[PDB]
């Protein structure tokens, strides 16, 4: 791998200024953070500033505690890329759907390392 | 369960055209994606072409690409191998399989008996 | 391409040993922290069939004694107890990009 789980979380699952959020845009950013090789069934973008993200991990000190799962306080704008039509390989098929809600992220040193990605299956 | 029947296949002259058929069921055939494999009489493996679930995407390898190609009927629930200038290079046993999803990391999980091909003078 | 180069091409093995089958790929066959590898068992007379996938899964109706390991470039099939209807042709094939490709294969007999 690269860095920690923390940056791998930012370069995976993390989004600032999404110039649009339809269709056109899951077919961008999935292939610009290597995702379709071969394409990936499933991925979730948050937008917004990192320190509203990083604010759902963090503890009163920094003594060092085990890892948890927290379900966020606040809701954020996030947009899910999923396959579509079963294409294996490039040019891999997607489809967006915007939402504006609640995350679930493991937490550790304050940090968020993983997101709970199953939860924007949903239909 | 599961079944992947093939027909088709034969003696066919150099320079010669053969269509394949594969004629899937116990399953929703529409619901994978499917591909075609051969086995040369040396007893190796050959991916020869895959088609997605949903039909809009197709691929190929080099050595066929220009002369073969996969398609589905399916009402009849049936793949397709269509053939062309063939040559001996393309004499083998073809199988008809079905690949796996993302989940099942695209592995193929069932593979049919095959249908021979021979081409020759 | 992704060229897999496995080995040995032949071996036999008594029965109750293990049998030890490897592939090397010339390029990684891994994303999302997955292995897109394969192995499928061919014996006389039949289709290949599916033993191993994404590396060190079970297909289903696969005795435990058949073990996938490996990532990255590296993997291997373990076979241990050998017992004699495991006699058969066994290739490793990778799906993380197109063309797919297959292992040369590796035919396993029983010693006697």
């Known amino acids: 791998q690269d860095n920690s789980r923390y940056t791998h979380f930012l370069t995976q699952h993390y989004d600032a200024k999404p110039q649009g959020r339809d269709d056109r845009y899951c077919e961008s950013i999935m292939r610009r953070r290597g995702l379709t090789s071969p394409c990936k069934d499933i991925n979730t973008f948050i937008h917004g500033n990192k320190r509203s993200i990083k604010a759902i991990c963090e503890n009163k000190n920094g003594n060092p505690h085990r890892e948890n799962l927290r379900i966020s306080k606040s809701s954020f704008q996030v947009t899910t890329c999923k396959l579509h039509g079963g294409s294996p390989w490039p040019p891999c098929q997607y489809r967006a759907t915007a939402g504006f809600r609640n995350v679930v992220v493991a937490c550790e040193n304050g940090l968020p390392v993983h997101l709970d990605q199953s939860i924007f299956r949903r239909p | 369960e599961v079944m992947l029947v093939e027909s088709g296949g034969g003696l066919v002259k150099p320079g010669g055209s053969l269509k394949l058929s594969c004629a899937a069921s116990?399953?929703?055939?529409?619901?994978?994606?499917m591909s075609w494999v051969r086995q040369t009489p040396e007893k190796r493996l050959e991916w020869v072409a895959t088609?997605?679930?949903?039909?809009?995407?197709?691929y190929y390898p080099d050595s066929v690409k220009g002369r073969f190609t996969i398609s589905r009927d399916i009402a009849k629930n049936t793949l397709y191998l269509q053939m062309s200038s063939l040559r001996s290079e393309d004499t083998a046993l073809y199988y008809c399989?079905?690949?796996?999803?993302?989940?099942?990391?695209?592995?193929?999980?069932?593979w049919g008996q095959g249908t021979s091909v021979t081409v020759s003078s | 391409d992704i060229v897999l180069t496995q080995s040995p091409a032949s071996l036999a093995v008594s029965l109750g040993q293990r049998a030890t089958i490897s592939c090397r790929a010339s390029?990684?066959?891994?994303?999302?922290?997955?292995?897109?590898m394969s192995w499928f068992q061919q014996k006389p007379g039949q289709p290949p069939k599916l033993l191993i996938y994404?590396?060190?899964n079970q297909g289903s109706g696969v005795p435990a004694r058949f073990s996938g390991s490996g990532s990255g470039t590296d993997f291997s099939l373990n076979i241990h107890p050998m017992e004699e209807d495991d006699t058969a042709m066994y290739f490793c094939?990778?799906?993380?990009?197109?063309?797919?490709?297959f292992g040369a294969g590796t035919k396993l007999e029983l010693k006697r």
């Open positions: 094939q990778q799906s993380k990009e197109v063309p797919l490709t």
């Open positions: 994404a590396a060190s």
């Open positions: 399989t079905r690949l796996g999803d993302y989940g099942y990391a695209y592995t193929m999980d069932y």
């Open positions: 116990g399953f929703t055939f529409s619901s994978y994606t």
């Open positions: 088609i997605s679930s949903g039909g809009g995407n197709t």
């Open positions: 390029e990684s066959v891994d994303n999302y922290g997955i292995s897109f």
